[PDB]
Each structure stands twice: as C-alpha cells, then as structure tokens.
Symmetry: C7
Amino acid sequence: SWLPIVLEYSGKVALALLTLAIGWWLINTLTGRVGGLLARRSVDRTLQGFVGSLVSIVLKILLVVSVASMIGIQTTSFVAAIGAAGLAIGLALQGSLANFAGGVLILLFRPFKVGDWIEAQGVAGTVDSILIFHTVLRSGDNKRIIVPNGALSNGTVTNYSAEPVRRVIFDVGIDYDADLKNAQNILLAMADDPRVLKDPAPVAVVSNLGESAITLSLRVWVKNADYWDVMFMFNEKARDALGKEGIGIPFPQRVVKVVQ
Amino acid sequence: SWLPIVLEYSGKVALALLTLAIGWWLINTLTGRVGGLLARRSVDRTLQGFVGSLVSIVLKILLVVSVASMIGIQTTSFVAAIGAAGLAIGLALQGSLANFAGGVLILLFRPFKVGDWIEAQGVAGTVDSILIFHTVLRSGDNKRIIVPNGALSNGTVTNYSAEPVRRVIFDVGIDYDADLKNAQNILLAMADDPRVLKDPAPVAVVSNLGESAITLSLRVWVKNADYWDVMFMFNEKARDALGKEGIGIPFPQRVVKVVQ
Amino acid sequence: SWLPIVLEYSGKVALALLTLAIGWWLINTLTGRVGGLLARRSVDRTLQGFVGSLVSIVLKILLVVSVASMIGIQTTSFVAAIGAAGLAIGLALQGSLANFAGGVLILLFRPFKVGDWIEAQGVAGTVDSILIFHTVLRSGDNKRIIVPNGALSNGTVTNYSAEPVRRVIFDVGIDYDADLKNAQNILLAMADDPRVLKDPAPVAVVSNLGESAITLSLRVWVKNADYWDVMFMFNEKARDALGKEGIGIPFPQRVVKVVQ
Amino acid sequence: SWLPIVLEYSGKVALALLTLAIGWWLINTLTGRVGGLLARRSVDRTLQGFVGSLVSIVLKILLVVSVASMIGIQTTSFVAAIGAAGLAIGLALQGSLANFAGGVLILLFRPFKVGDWIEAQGVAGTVDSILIFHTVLRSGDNKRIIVPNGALSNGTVTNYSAEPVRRVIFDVGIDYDADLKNAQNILLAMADDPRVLKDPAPVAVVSNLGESAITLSLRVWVKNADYWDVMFMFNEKARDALGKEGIGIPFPQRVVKVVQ
Amino acid sequence: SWLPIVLEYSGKVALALLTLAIGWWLINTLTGRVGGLLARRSVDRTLQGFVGSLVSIVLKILLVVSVASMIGIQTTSFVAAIGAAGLAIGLALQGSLANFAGGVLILLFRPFKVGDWIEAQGVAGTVDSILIFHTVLRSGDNKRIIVPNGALSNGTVTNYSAEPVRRVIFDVGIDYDADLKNAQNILLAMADDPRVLKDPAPVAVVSNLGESAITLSLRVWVKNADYWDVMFMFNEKARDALGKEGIGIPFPQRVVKVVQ
Amino acid sequence: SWLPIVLEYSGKVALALLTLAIGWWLINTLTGRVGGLLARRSVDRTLQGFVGSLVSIVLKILLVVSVASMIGIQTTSFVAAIGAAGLAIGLALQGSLANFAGGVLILLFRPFKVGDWIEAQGVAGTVDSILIFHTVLRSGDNKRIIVPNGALSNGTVTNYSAEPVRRVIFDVGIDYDADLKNAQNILLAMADDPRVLKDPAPVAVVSNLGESAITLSLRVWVKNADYWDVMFMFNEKARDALGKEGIGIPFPQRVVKVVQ
Amino acid sequence: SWLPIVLEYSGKVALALLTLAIGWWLINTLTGRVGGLLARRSVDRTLQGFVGSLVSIVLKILLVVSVASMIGIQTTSFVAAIGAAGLAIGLALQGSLANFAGGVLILLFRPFKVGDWIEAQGVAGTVDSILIFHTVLRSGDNKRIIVPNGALSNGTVTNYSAEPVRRVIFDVGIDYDADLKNAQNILLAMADDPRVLKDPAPVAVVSNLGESAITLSLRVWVKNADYWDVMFMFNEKARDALGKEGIGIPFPQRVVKVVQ
C-alpha cells in the first residue's frame, strides 16, 4: 500500500512550502514598509540601504533555516552559527544600548534640567537640551559639547544651580607681621552689601599659614544668581580696603645670605 | 477512515488558536494597565510610549513564536535570535542594575547616614539624601553632587563624622637656630583651651627637618564638632605666641656666593 | 521481509546525498561569485584568498556536520566545538563592529558636519570626511588624523563651529598698585571694533589676584568666524593701550632681604 | 471509544492543576516567612517590600511557565527570555559577590588582624573591625574608612605591625666641606638609647650626593612599637649634636656670577 | 525469536565501529599532512610538536565522545566539559584574533601606506612594512618598532605625509617694549624663500603675552617635504634678522626689591 | 484492565522516592563530614556555618529539581534559573581563582625563590614565603607586604638577586672648566678595591652635559652581594678624591645681569 | 509474561554497571600514570597532590553523572551545575592561556631574538631567553626581568638592534650671541671619525631657540654597535672644541632689575 507514509511526507512538504511562501511575502512587505517610513523621515540614503538589506537578509536566513529543518534536513550547525553571529552583533552594540538606558534613567530621576550649569565627565556648561542618546551643553565660551548619556548617568554630576543659596568663600594672602584680628574685622566690614545673606552670618577665619603670606578666608552666603558678582566685587574691594589700614598683599619673599 | 489524524491535528490547531486569543487579550490588558499606572504617576509622555510599546511588542513576539511552534512550524532559529537579543539587552543594562544593587547594599550595611560629611569617588560633602539609585551630597560651597550607588558601594568611603572624637594635629615651620624644647613647650601651653580633651594627653613633636624650616607638630584630641574651630584658633595663636619668645616663622632661605 | 527498514534507511541516505551534492554546488557557486565581485572592486589579492577560502571552509564544515548527522552519526561534540569557535570569532570582532555601530549613530544623530572644527579623543581639527568606520580630520598644521567612530560616538565631542556667536574673553595681568576702575574702563574702550556684538554688552571684571599681577578679564561676544582675529587684535592693543595711562604689565616680582 | 486519550489528557490536566495549587501555596508561605524574619531583624521597610515582592514574582513566573508547558503549551521562547533576564541579574551582581568572596578569603588566610596598622587601596589606618563585606579602618586623624573586601583581597596590603622588629633608617643633609667619617661617627654615637637593638648592629652610610648637601643615612633596628619615638628623638638630637662639632645643615646654595 | 532487537543493536555497533575506524584513519592522515606542511615551511620544532599533538588529541576526543554516545552511553556531561574547555580556549585567544581583524581592516581602508611618517599608540616613525598581524616602523633614530594591528586600528592615527601641503607656523618671544607692527613686518619679510607658498598668503600674529616675552607667531604654507628645512631656516634667520632693527630675544626677567 | 499504565507510573514514583531518600541521606552525611573536618582544622565558626549550609542547600536544590522532574513535572524554567545563578556565582569568583592559577604558575616556573629581593606591582622587598594564593615580602624597613599571585604572575617581575654579578655604575657632576680626561683617570684610580671585578674591565665615560655640571659615569662589575658597599664607598671617596686634583662638585650656577 | 520489560531494564542496568567499572578503572590508571610522569620530572610535591586529585575527582564526577543518567535518573540540574563550574574554571584561566598564545605568536613571527636590546611594557634590556610563557631580560645593571608573553605580544616593542645602521643625533646649547654658521661648521668638523658613515652625509641644524641657550643638533649615521662610543666621544669633544673658537655653553641666565 505504502500510502500512509507518502501522505505523511506530502503534508510536511506542503506545510513547509506554505510557510516558505507566506514568510517570504511577509518579509518583502515588511522591508518595503520600513524603507518607505525611513524615506519619509528624510534620513541619508546611505543609512537606508543597509537597514533594508540587513532586515531582509536576516529574516530570510532565519526563515530558510526553519523551512529546511521543517522538510527533512538537520540544521543544528546552522542554528549554532546563527547564535554565534547574533551574540557577536549583540556584543558589538553594548555602548549605544548603554547610552539609551542612561538616557532613560536621566529622564526618570532628574539630576539636572534645561538651564542648569553642570559639570561631569571632565567638561562643564549649561544644559541646552536632553535627549535619550546624549546631552548637549553650551560652554562658558559658547561652544557646544555633546556628552553621551551612559557614562553621564554612571558617573558623578555636580549641579551648580540646584540649590537656592550658595556660599562664596574668598581667599587673600596678607603680610606676616599684620595683626589678624584687625584684618578679619576689615574683611567682615566688606560684606555689608545688600546681597550677602545674614541667615548663616558671615565668617572670617585664618586658614593655613603660607610660605610668604598668611591666608585669610571670608565666608558668606548669597543667592545662587549673585555668586560671581559678589566674588568679583570682593576681588576688587579686598585690596582696596586692606591697604587702607596698613595691611599689604605681599610678593614671594626670600631671605638671602651673601657670602663674598 | 483517516479520522484519528484529522482530530489529532484539529485539537492542536484549536489549542493554538485558543492560546493566541487569550494571550493577545492578556497582553492588551496588561499594557493598558501599565500605561494607566504610568500616567497616574506623572512621568513624561516620551517615557510612556516606548515603555508600553516595548512591553507589548516583546510579549507579542514571544507569544507568536510560541503558537507558531505549537501548530507545526520549526522555530529554533527564531528562539536563538530571541535569546541573542535578550542577552544584548541584558548586557546593555549592567550599569543601572549595578547601581540598584549598590543602593540595596548601602541601605543594608550603613556606612554613612544623612548629615554625615563623607568623601568618595573624588568628591566630598554632606549627605543630603540616600536613594536606591544614587546619593545626593551638598558640597562645602553648597552645590549639589549626585553619586551613583554602584561605584560608591564598590569603593572606599571616608566618613568624617562617624567617630565622636577626632585628632587635630597641626604643623608649623620654625627657625633652624631655635631651641626645640622651648618651642614645643610653647606649643603645649597653647592647647589649654576648654575644648582640647585630656584623655589621650596632647603631644608636641619634631617632625621632618625641612629645607628652610624645622617642622613642629602639635597633636590634640577634640570632639568631632570642634575640629575646625580649634584648627583656626591654632592657625592664629601659633604665630602670635611663638613670636613672643623669639621664635620666628621663616621665609625661603637661600645662600648665594657672588663671583664678580 | 525486512523491506520497510531497508527503504526507511535508503530514503535517509538518498536525502543526505542529495543535500550533500546540492549544498556543495551552492557553496562553490557562492564563493566563485564572491571572489569575482571582490576582484572587480580592485582589492589586494592577499585580502581575497582568505576571504574566499574562509567562506568556503566554514560553509563546507557546517554542511558536512549536517549531513553526517543526517545519515546516522552523533555530532553533538562537533556542534559544541563549532559553537565555541564561532563565539571565539565573534569576540575577536567586537572592536570593528563597535566602530560600525558608532558610525551608524554618528550618521543618525549629527553632532558635527563636514567643515566643523571639533575636538575629541585627545585630538582636534577640521572634519574632512565622515565614513561609517572612521572620521578624518585635518589638524591646525594640516596633518591628517583618523579617529575610529566607536570611541568617538561613545565619548564627549566639543564642536567649536556649531553656535553662530561665541564669547572671546581675554586675560591680562596688571600692576598691583594700579587703580582697577580706570583699567577696566580702558579695557572697555578697546572693544569698540565693529566686530564686537552689543547684544550681551561687553564686560570687564577683576578675576583672581595673582602672585605678581592682578588679573583683569575682558568678555565680549563676536560671531563664530571673528574669534581669532579679535583675540589677536586684543593681544596687541592691550599692552599698547594700557601702557598709555600709566598701567604696566609686570614681571615676576620678588622681595629679598639681604643678610651680610 | 475515544476513552484512552480522554483520560490521558485528564491525568495531565489534573497533575498540572495540582502542581499549580501546591506551588502557589508553598510560594505564599515562603514569602510570608521571609517577610516575618526580615521584620524581626529590624531592617528598613523600603528594603522589605521589593524583597518579598521580588521573591514572590520570580517564583510565580517560574511556576506558571512550568505548568503552562505541562498542560500543552510550547514555552521555549519564555524559557529563553527567563534565561536572558537571569543572566542580566547575575551580571548586575558581580561587585557585591566579589566583595563577599574577598571577605571569605580574608577570613581564611589572615593578612591582618584587629589592631594592625595597614595600608591598601590608597588609604591607611588601624583595622577596627573585619566583616565579610567590608573592612573598617580608623585613620591617623581618627576618621572612619570603609574598604570593600574584594579589591582589598585582590591587591597588595602593607602591614606595619606584623613584624616584631623594624628598621628606623634616618636622613640628614650636611655641608659639602664636612668630613664624612667624623659625621657618621657622630651619628653613630647618637643611637646609644636603650631602645636601639644591637642585634643587627647600627649602620651609618653616605647615600647620594645631593645638589646642595651630602645625604647621610643612619640605620638602626628597634621594636615595632618604638618606631616613631626613636624617629622623633633623632629628628631633634640630629641637628643638636651635629652642630656641636662644626657640621651644619645647609640651605639651598647657589653660585651667581654678576655681570653689570 | 528476539531477532529484531539483536540486529537493531548489531547495526548500531557496526556503524559505531566503522565511524571509529574511518575517523581515526582520517585524523592520522590529516595530522601527518599538517606536520609535513609545517616542516616544509621551516618553523621551529618546538612549534610543531604541540601543533600536531594538539590537533590530534582534540579531534580524537571529539570522535571518541561521538562514538561512545553512538553505541549506548550518555555523554551530556562530557559534551558540557568539552564546551567549557572550548570556550576557555576561545577566550584565551581574543588578543591575537583582534590583531588579525585589525590587520584586515588596515588593509581594507588604507589610513597609511609604506613610506608615511605616522604617530600612534605612543610611538612614531616611518612605516616600513604592513602585515596582517603587526606594523613595522623605523624611528627617527632608525630603531625598529613593532605595533600590533588591533589597538592600532582601534585608536587614532596621525599621518604626517598624507597631505601635499603643510603649515609651518613658528614661535618667537620678543621684548615687551618692542613695537609689534615692525616686528611682524620683519617676520613677514623673512618668508620670501622660493619654498613658501603664496596660495594661503603668509600671516604674522601676536599670540599670548607671556611672563617675560611677547610671543609672535609666523604662519606659512609649504610643501609636505620642505617642512623641516623651512623650520630650521626660520630658527636661524629669526634671531639674526630681528636683532638688526633693535628687537631682542629676552631672558627670564625678574624685578627684585631689596630690603637691607 | 488499565494495569500496565498503573505499574508504569508506580515504577517511576518508586524510583523517584528511592532517589530522593538516598540523595537526602548522602547529602546529610557529606555535610556532616565536611563540618567535622572544618572544625578539626580550627577555622572560625563564622566560616563554617555558611559553608555547611551553602553545600547542603545547593545539593538539596539540585536533588529536589531532579526528582520533581523525575515524577512528572516540567522543570526547564528552574534549570534555567539554576544555570543563571551558577554562572553568577562563577563570575563572582574570578579573582580568587585567578590568584590560585597564578600561584600554580609561580610554583611551576620559578621566577624567584625565598630570599630574593624582587620588585613587582609597585612594591619591593625580600621574598619571605611563597604560597599558592599570595606571596609575602619583607620591605627594606621590615614591614610585611602581601601580593596576590594572579596579578603577580601576569606582570613583570624584576629579580635583583638572580645574577651572580652586577654592574655598579655611579654618577657625579663636576665643574664645566675641568679637564675630563684627568677626571675620568681619577675616577678609574678609585675602583682598585679588591671587590671590583676585572672581567669586564671598568669604564669611565662622559654622559650628558648638564645645566650646571658635566656628568661623569663610572661603571664597574661586582659580585651581587657587594653592590651597596661599593656604591657607598664610591659616594664617599668620590668627592674626597676629586677635590684633591682641583676638581670641584658645583652648586646650581646662575648668571645674572643687573640693570639698575 | 512481563518478560520483555524486565530484560529491557536489565540490559540498561548491565551496560551502566559495565560503563561504571571500566571508566573507574581507566581513570585510576590514567591518574596513576600522570602522577608517575609528574614525579619523574621532579616537580614539588605540593604541585602533584592537587593535580592528581583534581584530574581524578573531575573525571569521576563526569562518569558518575553519566551512569546515573544512564540507569534512570534525571540529571539536567547536575549537568547545568557542571557547566557553570567549568565556565568558572575556564574564566579563571584566561591570563595564563593568553600568555601561552602570546608565546606561540612570538615564536611564529620573530620581533626579537636572543641578544637583542629591546624595550617594552615599561622595562628594557637584553633578551636572554624566550620561552612560551615568559621572556627573560638582563637589565643595563644586570638584574633579571621576567615579562609575560601575552601583554608583550599585544603591545608595542622597540628593538634597538634590528637595524644595521643607526642615527646618533646630539644636542648642545650654545650662547645666544654666537654666530650659528661657524658653530655648525665646528660641529661638522667633529664627525671626521672613521666611524661616522658618509652614506647619508652628516648634518648640523639649529633646533629650537631655548630660554637660555640656542640648541644645535648634530646628526650622523653610525653602525649599530658604535652608537654609544660615538655619543660619549661627542659628549667630550663638543665642549672641548666649541670653546676654542669663542663659543661657550651657558648657565641659566637671568635679568634682574633692582629697585631699592
């Protein structure tokens, strides 16, 4: 009779050919649709060829392996090769996917916003736009910096604009023979500007004793937007006011014993 | 007859179609629920689209592969591709998951608490809030620092506020011709403040002999909150008290032989 | 009778031999076609031998393993070995594939264009051509720099030409005894060139007080193409104009106490 | 009849439902027990929610996949996805597990004990407590340092307290015109303290000839607890004793030819 | 009867023994051929023993595992062990395979050719020969440098000989009291050599104002082969021509206030 | 009848219960034995609890999964989870296993022995004991250094005691106006000690011409144990012998043009 | 009857017991042979115990798992655990296997030979012996350096002895007021030694203009063995010959304006 085995193989062959035809058609329509949507978004044509071709050839390889195994053929070696190639392609993508994950994290927890002056990854500047792949900064000189979001979200970020109040300190070296109480009193009667907060009242201390000058440090609290104005005003009035009561700002002193 | 094989295939097809319908419905309800709960928490709408779409497309791919294999089709190639893509996505997530694990570890063993001054990963400041993903610090200038918890928990952390008592040392360079016993006696009769503990009694030693000055080192124990006050008081009274008994603080000496 | 088993094995052997013959033929035609297309593109003949031979031997190993398993032989060990070798080859390719992925990313999001002066990965220069594998720069001395696209797209990039307007600052050290208001007025009446924008009006401030000179800083906005011309014009007119009103640019001062 | 197939499917369905019920119950009791034991140990309630929920959802996903495959459904895609997620979670845990392994190694081989002054990973201090996850140090200033055990056990560790006897060396620069034999004799008749061991008898040598002074080096053996006392005693008596026989400690000499 | 099972096992045993014999013979002939071809190429005999033995033992292990599983034995543990060993060997080969891939990339895209002066990976020199594993350079002192191709193709490469025209700049410090217009006119009437191109006409600018001298910068375009000749000619004629019109090249100035 | 299926399931259940009982008993005896042998070796009791418990729970999980799959249950998800956890534990162990492999390599090829002065990984000292996990060194100050064997065997090691003969060089700066032939003759008639080998006869050369002194270099061969004695003897006799024939060792010269 | 199933299980049990016995015997003989060959080569007995025991226990675990699965037991969990342990052991071996692969590469392509002075990995010296695991160097001071072959073959290597001819350059700073043509003529009439090749005729150029002296550079070609002799001869004759025609080698000049 030999009829049951003939129909048992014929059903397998018919199902394999049906799968082949339907899958080929579906892959063709899908790649055509992807190419159309990529052309509509006005991307460069170099970046469309090996996207359409990539998708088509990958899906066609998968389908051909599947149907070849469906008729009668052993394809364990080809499945192993496909797995190796897929793992290679996956490992060759870790940087970009890490950037996208870091961008998602930056959008979820908000360490900084647009307009903030931040400093991270060895650069600094004002946040101009946050995307999911990178962040854009404008430098102090108004040059554009692009920072990827992966390393950005996996490192430390200093945000200069997050707090409403900041602490301008100061630093000035004075003579060694000056009397320090009078000097810090002079420095304290220099923060009477109507921009220095009184909330944590100002302070004037003697920090380290340097090699040529004694270092005094003023310490005041201002609003986050008055930082640099107050710093520059100090930079000028400091000398102009210390020199009045006989306190100089000295040069690099030296003691020389001359043997002739 | 050929009836048993027909019903044997019909049962498989009916089970596959039931699975397809029920799974499609369940995925739709789940993604709708996830979208609703994400909208209720007021997250940005850019971060809702590719969460809902991501979940839906991943679950739908899995279900379609399962049912296609359930009817008659060989899908080992597609399972290999799915595994490769999943491993790629998993490797593109290691940084964030390491941050979450480090946050769990920081909450379990407590190296620092809110209010502590710590120093780690090249930054320093007062701990303002500990989350599971990052830690927030306020700098000495009151700028906000965000440190990820993975590298934080996998590195060394110095905690300045953990111990109740600290050791203020000091350092002052004096003349080479000064008598060192009298100088360290003077330095010892300068820590009579009612803030220097007597428990490990104060000490005054001659550390290294420098190139222009002999370095003396005071060493006292204070409470952890009086550290900087005592340091600054020393910074002032040191010169003011050494100079009284004829001990100066010298400049960068030099010996010059002039040949004319 | 023993006839069913004989034909059941004969069908397997016939299918295996058919697969072997057809696959061998297909591999031969494919490698011939690849060799022809590689010769037509004028690549070096060293780079054609171990491409054709590589493709042929890999596909032939896969086919031979498949047919050997198709007749009667257990080939799980050889499939494991093939998988190990494929994973090795995939891991030995991560750098180049990362470069191609970074090139795709640079073409998709455009951080820089041809003609822009950029700085990244420790080098700087004018973008001359962007490919998918590397980027080509011309240095300030007109030497050619080749930067791979992977590390380029995974790091920070500073673009000097992206913004239409830039901020030329300045820096000049002046005497300590000079009056700073008059000095910054002089510096302000030096940016009257018809190239300094008035939009964010120019500024002149006292930055840090140095060890030998007080540092003044002018700060003006220009168009992105007038940056260096304005900087050099300042470099000349600065001294020529400060010296007129009795403000010098000092040398490294020193105070020396001579003991004889 | 069709009875055998009906009971063959009914047994499978009954076993699957039994497995589902029993596994659900067991998972519920296990997560309740884990939550109870976590509450009894007084851990923060943020760290209990996503431990109980984590355990429950993971075990429930595994059980549901198992029973769904047990009735009739193909779940190879879901097993692949579960494996990918498990590998991701495992790779996101390598730092903490490395810390626990390093802690086990530090407890097994004992490089240091509590009370020892050690130096490793860029920090130094007295070992205060050794745990399996990290080691705690007290600095010389009495601030607390936390070092993870993985990098600690995988790097070099210097133990200052392991040996019963140490070698205090010394270093002093003397005049160029001094006679070196008399100078090292003077240095040798300065280690007559009853704290310098005679076992490897003391030594005094001429190390490098510097640019302004000739460097002499004493070298003595003391007990590990007398190191710093002997070093400071040398720091004082060195100058006080060299200067007696006409050997000075010179400043930075210079020879200047004046052209007028 | 028990005849069918006896022949069913006898066929398996006969096929396994046939496979064993044929595979052993094939492995022997293959390793003999490989040894012969390795001896004909005159490689060291240390490098032939553990190539022949390696190939033979690996193939024999694979074949023995296959036939042992073919008769009746379960060998899943041995296949797992073979896979682990193969993955170990593959990971212990990543550096060399990366070098070969980088060599292929260097041959495909040509960043440099034989004869070019390049600089990469911390070294510099003239390309002498490009192989697929490494690149050979001759240093400026004529010593041979060998650079592996992997890190070479994955980093930046500066090619000094790719462009037909280069820009010799210059740099010279002049007195502070000199008039800068006359000085840059003098520098401009020094590039009248018939080797300085007029295409981008020469330029002379005032770069930064230094601490002891004002820095002038000439800037000319030459052919890529006249770079160093023009640079050295400038190095001589610069002083010889500036000094003629009363412009000196100053030493490290200093201002010293003497207190006696 | 339904008897064959009942006994076919009863045999499976009986075998599963037998396996469960025997495996549970074997695991109990094995963990008891391991605990006993760990107690006999006097290890800390913290390190015994989570060794016994670890072994027991791992083996019990494996056995329970095996028997649950043996009766009727699908456990592919649990096998995937077990594999993920095992891979995690394996990756969390790479440092210690690398240390043990490096220790095996150090014992196999012997780069150094006990008593040798070596320098590696940023430290230096005398080898005191070599174990399979780490190496112990005594520093020049007699403090104990512990170096892990993995990084030690994977880096460069300098062995100061391996060769029987060493080359003491020297270095001394002399006046610029001295005659160099006479100076190197003086240096050569200073290595007449009966400790300087004549085998590669001594040499005296003029190395670089420094900024203040001309550098002479003696070069002699000694036995490996006389290195430092000869170096110190040179350090003394060098000045004492050069100064006799009118050759000085100069200070940092300077030429100063005074404008008043 | 129930006879067929009884014999079907009895054959499986007999084959499993045969496999167990034969495999146990083979493992015993193999480990005995390995121990004997390890004792004959005179390796330390610490390195024989955990080689014999390692081999025996690994092979015995594999065989026991195989036979336990061969009778009736499900061992997928144990195979997963064995695979995890094997992958762990393989990852804990990457450094040594990379060293062996680098050694094979160094023997295949020969970058250096015995006797060559090379410089790589931060060290330098004469190649004394090349093995497959490491390379041995003798330093300039005759101390022994051991460099692993992996990092050696994966980095740059500078070979000082590969080329037959080298270029000794020179460098000497002369007065600013000297005439440079006469000075380079003097330097050119100093390379008349019968060791300076005339093939690329000698050259004398003015390199950079320094801060205190003008730098002249001689440039000659010698044989690779005369490099240092010619360099030292230049180091002497340079001053002795320049000073004859009134060209000095100056000290660090300075210009000082004295305000009193």
